[PDB]
Amino acid sequence: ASVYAWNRKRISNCVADYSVLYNSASFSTFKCYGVSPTKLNDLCFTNVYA
Amino acid sequence: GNYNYLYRLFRKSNLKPFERDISTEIYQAGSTPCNGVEGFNCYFPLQSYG
């Protein structure tokens, strides 16, 4: 989508494998501002907005 | 900008009490090994306060 109409996907009621997302080398920027990248597979959240 | 004061942004484990780490070895922040060379998910542990 465009940036003025960014698509929001609600991630809920599922188990999320962030290790596959973090170990991918295609991403040129992986910057977190409230959590740690190595603790995403350990913590639990109510829902994720993508 | 006074950049002479630095803190350890990245480390593998928490320190002991009264433990000092001055080792300027590279950190592996991803699955790919760094081999002492900066790159993708390879960051210097010591970053300066701005």
* Tokens representing residue A6 in the block: 């960014």
B33 touches chain A (CB under 8 A): no
CA distance B14 to chain A (A): 15
CA distance A30 to chain B (A): 9
Nearest to B24 by CA among B4, B8, B39: B8
* Tokens representing residue B22 in the block: 């001055």
What determination technique applies here? cryo-EM
Specify which residues B39 forms β-bridges with: B42
Chain A neighbors of B32, CB-CB under 8 A: 25
B40 touches chain A (CB under 8 A): yes
Distance in angstroms (rounded) separating the CA atoms of residues B45 and B50? 16
3-state helix/strand/coil string of chain B: CCCCCEEECCCCCCCCCCCCCCCCCCEECCCCCCCCCCECCEECCEEECC
Buried b (16+ CB within 10 A) or exposed e, A10-48: eeeeeeeebeeebeeeeeeeeeeeeeebeebeeeeeeee
Q: Which residues, 6+ apart, have CB-to-CB distance to B3 below 8 Å?
A: B48, B49, B50
Amino acid at B36: G
DSSP character at residue A49: E
